[PDB]
Amino acid sequence: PIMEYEPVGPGLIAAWLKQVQEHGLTHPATITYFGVISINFTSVDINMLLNVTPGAEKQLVIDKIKEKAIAWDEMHPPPPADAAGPVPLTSDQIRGIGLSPEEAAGPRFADARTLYRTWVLEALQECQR
């Protein structure tokens, strides 16, 4: 969470798990809850919540995020071998993979983590039964 970065607390992790367990990952109330708690989240924070969620609908949601990342990267291909950048915003950056928690809270990824929150909200909605 960004305020100065602080990691997602055990209290909120426990509350998220309780919400998912009692109502399901893609229940409208759970999606709404994710929407609210992720407002100040980095992409790394969002992944914390996704990752602690027990392993059918979870895989489907993850797959939908994967599909959004594929479509993004196809529309934003990086420069060829040997050619100078700048590199476009890539889906692994949007997803915060390989970013230190601190790095993920920095100004370089403000629009990126906002977009990622949207990808996840959409993935959750798309997998709602």
Add this chain to the structure above:
Amino acid sequence: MVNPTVFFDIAVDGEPLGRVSFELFADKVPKTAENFRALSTGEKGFGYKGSCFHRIIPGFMCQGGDFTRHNGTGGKSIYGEKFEDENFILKHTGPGILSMANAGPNTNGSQFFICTAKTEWLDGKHVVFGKVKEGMNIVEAMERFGSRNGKTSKKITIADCGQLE
């Protein structure tokens, strides 16, 4: 001292499109500004005149300045093949920002890009050193001749360039 202004006269398949001028932020990044200025006048015996924008990506940026290899693998500065990142004081705040292309830390040569959007993920990685003054509508026209991977549908060239005032 006053920040220098330089111009590119841009052509599309050899036909004059129009002029884009830039303020160079010599007050904040004098070394980087001077490199671009000198390459624009051709006073060192080499530079931007006749070169192309080899990589134009709509919604991202227009990249050029590779006057040796014309494909993103070349270019050189007035300080040698590469020079260091001068500083990262200025940020990629939106359309019109002029910034150094590079292939990693301290690899500045002659290649540059003109943002057509805010590109904040590049902050602290590419040295910002100027901004479009006149001719943003020309840059927008150039941008439309690009594609997702940068390949241009028309030859976009710097027909002439120099320093104003």
